Amino acid sequence: SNADDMIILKGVNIFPIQIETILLQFKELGSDYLITLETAESNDEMTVEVELSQLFTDDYGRLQALTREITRQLKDEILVTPRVKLVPKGALPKSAVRVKDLRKTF
């Protein structure tokens, strides 16, 4: 997938496969994720959406804790803090584009 293609965010080189590897270890998550890069006002932001496993039906307290732990682990690896969003099973396009970069190349 384009996950193999190095990206650059606020000066920091990041290999999306790093993110994938971390996400895969969570039983609560499915294997499908989408990294979206965009320019918010002045600066660049990374969002990491990942599908929940169909087995995950726990309360919002647990969902929040899971989101926090994923965020922590990703920051430790890639050295920038992504915005992590857990989404329902099936919510991401299965039609392997793992990174959507909406920033301008300029």
Write the DSSP string, 42-80. TEEEEEEEEEEPTT----HHHHHHHHHHHHHHHHHHHSS
Provide the resolution (angstroms). 1.4
SS3 state at 91: coil
Cα–Cα nearest to 48, from 38, 61, 59, 56: 38
Specify the experimental method: X-ray
Distances (CA, A) of 70 to 41, 96, 105: 26, 22, 29
What does the alpha-carbon distance between residue 78 and residue 19 come to, in Å, rounded to a whole number?
A: 8
Distance CA(86)–CA(84), nearest Å, equals 7
Q: What is the number of other CB atoms lying within 10 angstroms of the CB of residue 33?
A: 22
Helix, coil or strand: residue 106: coil
Total domains present in the chain: 1
CATH of the domain at 102: 3.30.300.30
**The residue count for the chain:** 106
